[PDB]
Design a protein around this ligand. Structure first.
Ligand SMILES: Cc1cc2nc3c(=O)[nH]c(=O)nc-3n(C[C@H](O)[C@H](O)[C@H](O)COP(=O)(O)O)c2cc1C
Ligand SMILES: Cc1cc2nc3c(=O)[nH]c(=O)nc-3n(C[C@H](O)[C@H](O)[C@H](O)COP(=O)(O)O)c2cc1C
Ligand SMILES: Cc1cc2nc3c(=O)[nH]c(=O)nc-3n(C[C@H](O)[C@H](O)[C@H](O)COP(=O)(O)O)c2cc1C
Ligand SMILES: Cc1cc2nc3c(=O)[nH]c(=O)nc-3n(C[C@H](O)[C@H](O)[C@H](O)COP(=O)(O)O)c2cc1C
Ligand SMILES: O=[N+]([O-])c1ccc(O)cc1
Ligand SMILES: O=[N+]([O-])c1ccc(O)cc1
Ligand SMILES: O=[N+]([O-])c1ccc(O)cc1
Ligand SMILES: O=[N+]([O-])c1ccc(O)cc1
Ligand SMILES: O=[N+]([O-])c1ccc(O)cc1
Ligand SMILES: O=[N+]([O-])c1ccc(O)cc1
Lengths: 337, 337, 337, 337
């Protein structure tokens, strides 16, 4: 069978195909309490019916002030467990595996009141200046990722992904453009990586399953991080037990980015080869032919699909047809697929 | 703009477009009690997110022995109201109108114990011979359609459709091939239509909203019903206040049917023109071009889509693209659609 | 199989499928002598390689002053025979049948010098007033259609189509909006039809093969011709031996026309049913599903494709795929189709 | 504009886009004289009307016994000039540039009589054993490529490509699996490359325009040539003035090849980077998205399309639509494109 529909096993978790629903914020928690709503249930479960191998739930805040907006999903309270337990059970029942992206928006948080970051530097001219986290606060945040991971495990998730990309809190600590700290969390690449290092180690104390980390492989800015920097971080993550690196890019600050089909694939290929780390490719991949080429030419291990899954929830079927192959259909739709 | 995406008003109900999700059994009520399950919620709500103007819920039995299978949805108990109330609230919240198809499988019921029909004539060689309904039993069944309609209203449905097609109970009374009764419910076309006439009148005593009736416009069999007979029934339904006739065909008995794109459209066009009744076209309609042609040439008023919505839940978007036009996307998917 | 790809026989001509390349002017006779050029050869022959059942060559003038533009093809001289003979030989060699549309632009001719029409009435504000043809001039023109038909036969064409549509000379005589004559060629519907009647009879004196006539089934204007008038003309054409009526519409004068997929199909269906005449459907038909629906529901006998064949010369292949069926490919492309 | 539709200049020749019609044998010279036929004219010219930037004419034999079949095109006689001159003139008139692939089938020639190769080793068990070319014959063949190039120049071609791939004569000399010669044309990579070296140098004495060379970048066989070998040959070709290397693979002998979308792209990327040579990518590239990715990620300079151009002669238009961009349409089809 096509590589796109060939299984892969990661830490006891076996995915039936290589299609992954990339995490995408829905801004639909209208009660502003970070809880799930019927919309979220239908939104996610429908792609499970659609045969996506792994569905990654949108950025879920580990602290209420770490939300991007007050409509974001959260996982900062035990009260969030009940809802997530229902979602994981139903997604798995339809045949898919499910993961959750643990997040903290840092200086890009669009909330009232003080927002936090490694240094008091605003995202742009239209944003509020964040408050520099005290060492105590940085360590409490590490514990919040750990506590959130514990809740995710209890809720039944198969995979946990750490959001270290798109200019949010962890990415802010990683890049010299946003981190000007003078303590143990700033300076050398070792110190800039320390926040992520501690998060990974603490999460490992409560979670032994598949662990993914999403990164922005380049800042596309002078004096910022580039692929060489991320190959270095990737080697350190490998040593810590990270199973796969989800390769995105940009958004730390505004930058000129040449966007085209497969524009972020070179990052996934370089990290995979140089860091001997499994990688996820993402970025304007909209058909089965490109997905297959990426996998077959050894550029990545999983194909993350975002916007095409918003246009076509049953992308798996469409891709199978494009590749002239067959895949199992959800039982209820056998007479249509 | 395109007619397919132009609003239409029926009674006090306005549909935002003319695309309808044709009723389709999901055989997913696993507890065998006719109640809804999480799968049903995701299945239906996802097409509401997908912008379908009107979603018609699958055949729902008005009596437990009227189910096609023990895994069918039901509406014979007040215990069914709670679940349906949640479903209608969520589908409408996503922007669509919702209907329910009231049904009774008659001699095609696949259940243990006696099954019923107008006459003791089996569907085929592999089916049990049904019990001829006594006149009182027929009247009790009319009351059950009435009681089911009352529950549908309480649950919040916008439209009610009577299932008088596909060889089920009502169709069985309508056709001389299956109705050999010699009492008030058999013989002349008027008497064969009496059961449906009484159901329509009783339903109208508890429901004043949009009322649709789905028919099989031909039996494709010698001595059976043909389009001329249905044009006649349509005129009577118009007099009774039926708002639209959903035009399907066949299934009373096995028959040779030439299937092709738009194979049932001639039924919708003839009933529309000769009975001055709004009609719904259904049958191998899979793209926006054909849908627009049917509406623009005056062959039907609503376009019912079945299997294409199982392959593409977001058919509305696909059709809009095919017609080189734009439609509103669910707010959450604005950056993908 | 699919009706679209089932053979059909007209007289002594059998078409391998029911797809027809609608006549389309290319304005490529640069020497202004009506002769063919290399571009015409590649343009037409490529659709023969593409498996179109019947290819109809663009409007070819029967008199030099009957051209739409000085870049049009012509068939008014024996000097035109040599070129056409080469074209018919090559198109037929590739497996298709070929026809030619005999024409005269009348008052819509864009040439220097006097132009002719049934009455001295200009097409519009930006057009020259035509000279009213004397009775003798009308008779000379009938002889020119006859002489052109004889040349078409000598050149090897399989079908001859008379252009009686789109506001050109013959259509001008047919409509009371443009024909105000008081002699034998004007007044009653019979007299307005006389010019076409004589052309058909004279052409039949030199041509006994398939004869098509393209009409504009409606003027979409008050006091102008409508489908009822054309059903009448169709009955007369049937009596005269015309084999098929190619159903287009409009262009006699400017008018508001609602265009959409299959907007001219009702004309083909009504003429077919009421005049018992084979018809060709044309007008925004761009896919195999609609083509099959038109044929299966008995709305027309041949499907004429214009613009979609300019976008996709191999539409036959595309349509076959859309209908989930297989057709023979040109031998040279067996490893691609 | 998209890179796929961005120009590129090679030795005074400017291509308007990066789409190239890969050379494809048509086996249509029915007179067995290597001359062009109307089919060839329509076949090639239609893709020029279709806006392909560069059209490469199929393998054309430099010696009659170098044909693959007796139906192949040839360029071994001055009599072939007349026909080619007409083809180049007409393709250029439609807006495209045109090239020709100079070839000699070697041991894969399917002709009666002795066939030639560097060594007496058959292609497979179903093929005739070739005659080992004498040194005199090898040198005469070099002169035939030179003489053929002179004819191509006189005929008006814009580009000349040397066929050194797919197991034909030149490839046979390059690989140790097929070349066991003990003279100056066999042994070391220098001697195995000598035949090609002399062909390039002699062709340069009569042709100063764009020069392409198509190679099979791997034999996919133990002890055969691999990408490392071809990177080496590429460096030598660069020194000799070759402008671009058309990167194909296989066919020297039967081998197990994993075929998938873009399966030969790694060869084009590696040769481009390591030999600093412009390259052409080819192999299961069927859409504009993949074509754009290949160009944008710097994997090749030109995108060669074979089978998709047999299915869709107007691939350029399709690709433009897929990339959401606009390109000029042939004047005659402005109302369709
Ligand atoms: C509406 C929307 C919401 C998104 N939310 C998230 C998110 O919560 N976490 C994340 O890592 N990326 C997020 N992304 C980025 C996507 O996951 C994905 O990486 C990006 O769209 C590139 O892929 P695509 O071209 O397949 O859409 C979002 C994108 C969109 C359009
Ligand atoms: C899985 C499945 C379930 C169906 N269930 C119902 C039903 O409950 N009631 C009904 O009236 N028709 C039912 N139908 C018939 C469809 O509503 C529809 O009329 C038919 O499929 C023709 O349309 P299509 O070609 O768009 O699918 C069902 C069809 C399928 C394939
Ligand atoms: C460029 C062009 C040239 C045409 N030339 C002719 C012609 O010579 N004769 C004719 O009867 N119709 C002519 N037509 C009308 C077409 O044959 C056809 O009936 C019309 O485009 C409707 O079909 P379509 O939607 O498939 O294109 C032409 C149309 C176009 C766009
Ligand atoms: C019918 C046919 C004829 C071909 N003839 C030639 C040829 O003359 N010269 C050549 O170098 N390749 C030839 N090829 C190989 C193609 O040019 C092309 O490299 C191959 O099909 C891979 O690309 P594709 O997937 O885009 O078709 C031919 C392929 C086919 C299917
Ligand atoms: O809402 N969005 O567009 C987002 C949200 C989170 C993220 O990581 C990237 C984009
Ligand atoms: O839409 N859904 O999938 C749902 C909706 C509500 C619910 O309680 C469970 C699942
Ligand atoms: O399950 N099914 O296939 C069905 C069920 C009901 C109906 O009206 C038609 C078909
Ligand atoms: O393009 N073509 O098909 C042609 C061109 C020239 C010719 O003499 C015959 C056919
Ligand atoms: O050039 N054109 O657009 C035309 C030419 C002839 C015709 O019958 C219709 C349209
Ligand atoms: O005919 N064919 O399939 C061919 C011909 C020539 C070539 O280089 C490769 C394939």
């Amino acid at each position: 069978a096509r590589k796109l529909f060939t299984p892969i096993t990661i830490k006891d978790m076996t995915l039936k195909n290589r299609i992954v629903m990339s995490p995408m914020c829905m801004y639909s928690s209208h009660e502003k309490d970070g809880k799930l709503t019927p919309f979220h249930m239908a939104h996610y479960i429908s792609r499970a019916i659609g045969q996506v191998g792994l569905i990654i739930v949108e950025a879920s805040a580990v602290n209420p002030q770490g939300r991007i907006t007050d409509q974001d999903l959260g996982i900062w309270s035990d009260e969030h467990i009940e809802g997530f337990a229902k979602l994981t059970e139903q997604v798995k029942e339809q045949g898919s595996k499910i993961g959750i992206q643990l997040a903290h928006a840092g200086r890009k948080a669009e909330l009232e009141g003080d927002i936090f970051a490694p240094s008091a530097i605003a995202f742009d001219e239209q944003s509020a200046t964040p408050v520099e986290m005290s060492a105590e606060k940085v360590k409490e945040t590490v514990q919040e990722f750990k506590q959130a991971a514990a809740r995710a495990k209890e809720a039944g998730f198969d995979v946990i992904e750490i959001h270290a990309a798109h200019g949010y809190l962890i990415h802010e600590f990683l890049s010299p453009l946003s981190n000007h700290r003078t303590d143990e969390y700033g300076g050398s690449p070792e110190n800039r990586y320390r926040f992520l290092r501690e998060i990974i180690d603490e999460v490992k104390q409560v979670w032994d399953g598949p662990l993914f980390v999403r990164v922005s492989a380049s800042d596309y800015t002078d004096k910022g991080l580039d692929i060489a920097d991320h190959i270095g971080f990737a080697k350190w993550m490998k040593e810590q037990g990270v199973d796969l690196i989800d390769c995105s890019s940009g958004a730390l600050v505004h930058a000129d980015i040449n966007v085209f089909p497969g524009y972020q694939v070179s990052f996934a290929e370089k990290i995979r080869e140089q860091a001997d780390m499994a990688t996820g490719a993402v970025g304007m991949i909209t058909d089965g032919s490109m997905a297959e080429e990426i996998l077959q030419n050894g550029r990545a291990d999983l194909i993350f699909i975002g916007r095409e899954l918003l246009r076509d929830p049953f992308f798996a079927r469409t891709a199978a047809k494009q590749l002239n192959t067959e895949i199992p259909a959800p039982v209820q739709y056998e007479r249509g697929w």
